[PDB]
Amino acid sequence: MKAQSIIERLAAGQVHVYPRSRHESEGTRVQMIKAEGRKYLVAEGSGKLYDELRGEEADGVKLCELSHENRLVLNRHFPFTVPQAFGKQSATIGLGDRLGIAGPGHVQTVRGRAIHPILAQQSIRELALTGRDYKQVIDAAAYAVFQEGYTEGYGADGDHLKKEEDIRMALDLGFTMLTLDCSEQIDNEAAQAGESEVKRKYEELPESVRSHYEAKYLDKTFQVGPHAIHFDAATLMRDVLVYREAIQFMIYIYEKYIQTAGRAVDFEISIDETLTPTAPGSHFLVASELIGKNVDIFSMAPRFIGEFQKGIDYIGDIAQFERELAVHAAIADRFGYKLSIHSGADKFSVFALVGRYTNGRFHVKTAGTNWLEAVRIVAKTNPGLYRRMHQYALEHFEEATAYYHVTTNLNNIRPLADVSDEELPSYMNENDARQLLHITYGLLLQAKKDDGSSLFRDEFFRTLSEREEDYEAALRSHIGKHLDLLGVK
């Protein structure tokens, strides 16, 4: 019980204290501590806070594991640690951490910037691949703001939810933002089909439904910004076919879980994952239905022309994309929600355009690139460890391609036998090696020997714990490039 002798090593200034982490609650003072390579909670005083925190005692001092339990307790006393919504009228960034250790660095990039962090952000996919739960995602976010004294507030976004089970769960754990992914009710068939065929599939709809869209939309012209959107029969029928059922999904969920939720929630609707790129006029029609039914949209995340792959920059004609971007953006302003950029990390070619055309009102989601900067550190710090996992990613690539859409050319990665140790980090500058390391993250983390220990993960977390100020330095730099290119003041 007395290995809490650690506290005396702290008395002498022989443990790292986290400067901004002191915060009181009535009689108790709580500050955060790394000691022997473990972060700790350290409190002295008296009151409902001290008594509720779990820990070993010694003095009027307690040493608490950074636990889910103790953060629920910190949630009860310290409200900045609790997630919070921000609204559609502001600049936000999603800061995905698939590891639970990118928080503090994420916090240190936003302090001083005119942007709101969505510190906790994972998709259901990432919880599966990594084997984590949503309690953990909030834990790291809430301990990151505490550890760094970021009290200006942060968000928890359940990302890419599709099953109703997931929405209830994310609701239950206090996620303040919800991302309904509907890329899968998109009739990708009707989008490629021919004029005489859409009409066939469209005339197979109820009169009431067909009378609806035609009265509301047909042959009329909508002045968005300096942007006229017009619907002939050929276009209306296609978009109704292509998007109808997905529109119906959004409205059902808004009514069932979002608006009955009892607290503020950001409702992001997402279709960036479709195969059908979201045509601007199509975008107009989906919001116009959502809004005319009094859905309260935080943000739309469409499928832009060209392709947004994981870990790499835009693929397409950037001139065309700007022309699509201007109208999307104009659509989101007339309606008053924001455009949400998925797969946004490393899309350096789109950032100024996004910033300008949205006058700073946008959502940009990063996640894997943070796992990639941690991979950079191993390459910089544990060459052998990186070699061991660079090779395992190789032999399990085609596996992981069942879960992300990437056109990686395996034939652009210099063989491991060919790059010196100090040349390892430069892989994390390269398109193909980046994508290789990007999507294989679930296999690496879950890798076990037939002994059942972690093949990689535990050794990986120790070096990351050891070169922490490095990791955080990388995030500050890589994520800053992003925010400066976006024009965050």
- Name the residues annotated as catalytic: 159, 268
Q: How far apart are CA 456 and CA 7, in angstroms?
A: 32
Of 62 and 342, nearer to Zn ion (C-beta) is 342
DSSP conformation class of 307? B
Rg of the chain over Cα atoms, rounded to whole angstroms, equals 24
Of 330 and 341, nearer to Zn ion (C-beta) is 341
Question: From the CB of 179, what's the least distance to Zn ion, in Å?
Answer: 7
Closest residue (Cβ) to Zn ion?
342
What is the bridge-based pairing of β-strands 38-44 and 61-65?
antiparallel
Number of residues forming the site for Zn ion (CB under 5 A): 1
Of 244 and 303, nearer to Zn ion (C-beta) is 303
Span near Zn ion by CB under 5 A; candidates 99-107, 226-234, 329-337, 340-348: 340-348
Of 81 and 122, nearer to Zn ion (C-beta) is 122
End-to-end CA distance of the chain: 50
Q: How far apart are CA 432 and CA 421, in angstroms?
A: 19
Question: From the CB of 159, what's the least distance to Zn ion, in Å?
Answer: 6
Span near Zn ion by CB under 5 A; candidates 290-298, 339-347, 428-436, 463-471: 339-347
Question: From the CB of 344, what's the least distance to Zn ion, in Å?
Answer: 9
Question: From the CB of 272, what's the least distance to Zn ion, in Å?
Answer: 6
Question: From the CB of 21, what's the least distance to Zn ion, in Å?
Answer: 31
Provide the token pair at 347: 């899309």
Question: From the CB of 94, what's the least distance to Zn ion, in Å?
Answer: 8
Question: From the CB of 436, what's the least distance to Zn ion, in Å?
Answer: 20
Of 342 and 361, nearer to Zn ion (C-beta) is 342
Of 80 and 403, nearer to Zn ion (C-beta) is 403
Give the H/E segment covering residue 31.
strand 28-35
Could you tell me which of 98, 89, 148, 92 has the C-alpha nearest to residue 121?
98
Question: From the CB of 459, what's the least distance to Zn ion, in Å?
Answer: 29
Span near Zn ion by CB under 5 A; candidates 88-96, 291-299, 338-346, 413-421: 338-346
**The one-letter amino acid at 485:** L
Q: Is the CB of residue 476 less than 8 Å from the CB of residue 109?
A: yes
Of 139 and 272, nearer to Zn ion (C-beta) is 272
Contact status: 310 vs Zn ion (CB under 5 A): no
Q: DSSP 3-state helix, strand, coil percentages of the chain (rounded to 5)? A: 50, 15, 35
Number of other residues whose CB lies within 10 A of the CB of residue 339:
23
Span near Zn ion by CB under 5 A; candidates 15-23, 199-207, 280-288, 336-344: 336-344
Partners of 93 in the β-ladder: 117, 364
Q: How far apart are CA 239 and CA 464, in angstroms?
A: 48
Span near Zn ion by CB under 5 A; candidates 19-27, 215-223, 342-350, 458-466: 342-350
| Ranges within 458-487 binding Zn ion (CB under 5 A) | none
Question: From the CB of 96, what's the least distance to Zn ion, in Å?
Answer: 9
**The one-letter amino acid at 167:** I
Among 39, 238, 303, 342, binds Zn ion (CB under 5 A): 342
What is the number of H-type helices and E-type strands within the chain? 21, 17
Of 213 and 308, nearer to Zn ion (C-beta) is 308
> Exposure of 277 by Cβ count < 10 A (0-12 exposed, 13-18 middle, 19+ buried)?
middle
In degrees, rounded to 5, the angle at the alpha carbon of residue 43 between the alpha carbons of residues 27 and 11 is 120
Place of tokens 């942060």: 154
Span near Zn ion by CB under 5 A; candidates 11-19, 114-122, 335-343, 376-384: 335-343
Place of tokens 């199509």: 282
Q: Is the CB of residue 75 less than 8 Å from the CB of residue 81?
A: yes
Q: Is the CB of residue 232 less than 8 Å from the CB of residue 195?
A: no
Span near Zn ion by CB under 5 A; candidates 71-79, 80-88, 231-239, 334-342: 334-342
Q: How far apart are CA 399 and CA 382, in angstroms?
A: 26
Of 342 and 434, nearer to Zn ion (C-beta) is 342
Q: How far apart are CA 283 and CA 325, in angstroms?
A: 11
> Exposure of 118 by Cβ count < 10 A (0-12 exposed, 13-18 middle, 19+ buried)?
buried
Sequence-ordered alpha helix ranges (H) in 149-205 = 164-172, 188-192, 195-202
Q: Which residues bind Zn ion (CB under 5 A)?
A: 342
